[PDB]
């Protein structure tokens, strides 16, 4: 049993609970507190056995089938308050165990305020009295609607209408009279000087803990801090409004079991019998406060503390937070409404009118986007496969193999350019000659060892008929008679990915002994053109093929009941006109200073570096400046970048016809202007004789392109590109390109040592989706073509400020532009503007595309 829980909880106490579990049963409990837990669970669970989080996010996990249905006996359900069970019900089924209950309360300073107001209506009078002594009645975080909603909801008003175990995303309750009344009262307190419309979390928490305000509104997480102050304080029921209870949202900390866990009946034993007990929860409570708990017996003990009783009281008068993803539409719309109404930028009536309409609209769009993503993940390539076609293609491929074999006889061997290719050997070092100003040419194998065999989960395809089947179905067309296709068992690929990551961690995040051991089992494919397909078995996983898709009849029976997908392809580009163009643009952009140094690696392309406050258009800072300062042609670098991306993309697409289909599928109309030309590339890297640790990428597109070329002569040892879960590695020769699914295939580059002046230039062409989303969003807010003018303006205003009042005054102006840009992006992001299609579950692109289902019934 592996359990993840947040770092601000009592995990060591929960680890003690796990220790009492390993004594009675011979089962160890290991408790991690991973960072970024909110988002890291839905990313990894899609591909711990127990997860500890607020119930509201578990509805989303349930929609994605990341949780097990919990089946407690009605005798165990009686140990817990019934509302806490509603917290953990998605679509009629129980999806987690309730642990703790949490809601806002009224917190008051006893010395300033022995009898706290029962009602909101007596607060302005009470602020009068307090104002005499230079103190305020009430100060709380007005910036986040989680805090102001209790008041707004009191007289009616709700997020989404609950009915028949479901939230109706179309029925928003922001706009009614009850809500208007509540918000009107809130802004009235501001317009009568009682509350300051600027007050946030920190301001309110400072003021109360120093004795400047009599009351604050906060939750149990805040008690610790007050405990360190000179304040004598209580915690009580929230004030009523028009005689109704303030209605705060209730968050129920819950424990859900992973749907992909083999450990279901022994996590059920652990949580029902070792944590949900008085000694179980107290163990955890000693480590860290829980506030109110769901377990009736222990709650009765904690309720002896008035603060805890007050929490449960406010919780029972409140509303349980909807466990659906569309709460984000609700929150953003209401946050804007409250900020506007409180600043006088809108009438209360106008603010809630717009919030209602916007939330409804955004909630609808998010559902539309979820259904569209499914069609993206399930989309098929234009059909070229047929039994006649694959037979025809196999003949053609078979003819090409005889030709290549005759060429190989006539020439005395196999060659990639001038480099001798012999798969009996593994190329550990190699020599390049630079006889002219063109690219240095790979000429001679220097060091070698016998070439390791393929690992057992990777098979070379021998049959031309099978070659044809995959080629047609997968949009791959490698050099006829001069390539090798491989099939990789999908389960073993995922296991080997984890082993590779483990090795890199054990080596201390570098190429060390564990990575080297793996490398020694990697077979060399230097000088080869190859493709790897992974085959997913029908469940009857890291990869998500739809087994409801159309099926083809394979000539190979072993493919039946499986789906294939392209995970990697190595091309050897013949030195010529395209390599001239590509290499020239690198040289142009290097000379003209258009590569920015980053976290090392140089980058160029259509970035949006938000850390640069004054950035408001596509490209790195040097690119913004070159458009303005040039005295010949302002778009020159943009022309050079587009030719660079398009020439690489063209060379790749000749061989891999799925690539344009992937481009057309994932780039939205709003994203197209921010790609480099008609490609799926928006960022291009450049490295000089550099290795990189084994890793998966996370926030890139489905496939990434990597290329290399060489400048002077000399010898390179090491520097192989390694794909350890595919069991292969290679030295880049004249112009090697790899196209691969970098979010799902571990990959890295070993350190190099050189003799002579030789430079190996490496370059990744990839889709960094955050930049294209932010830019698509800026395009929506300002107009695509207006960005250049805005960039030109913002550069002048900042230079003027720097030229007039110094660096600090300039960075103040940048800071101003950043906040304005941030506001514009946020509003478009909330209106669901996107540059790319993304998994709403993961916030990432799909793990692969264009799965083909094979079935051979008899
Ligand atoms: Fe990478």
Author numbering: -366 to -320, -316 to 176, 185 to 243, 250 to 508
Question: What do the authors of the reporting publication say about this deposited model?
Answer:
Very lately, a TET homologue in a green alga Chlamydomonas reinhardtii, named as CMD1, was found to exhibit a novel enzymatic activity. However, unlike the canonical TET proteins, CMD1 uses vitamin C (VC, l-ascorbic acid) rather than 2-OG as co-substrate, which surprisingly contributes the glyceryl moiety (the C4–C6 atoms) to the C5-methyl group of 5mC with glyoxylate and CO2 as co-products. Structural analysis shows that CMD1 assumes a typical DSBH fold. The Fe2+ at the active site is coordinated by the three conserved residues of the HXD…H motif.
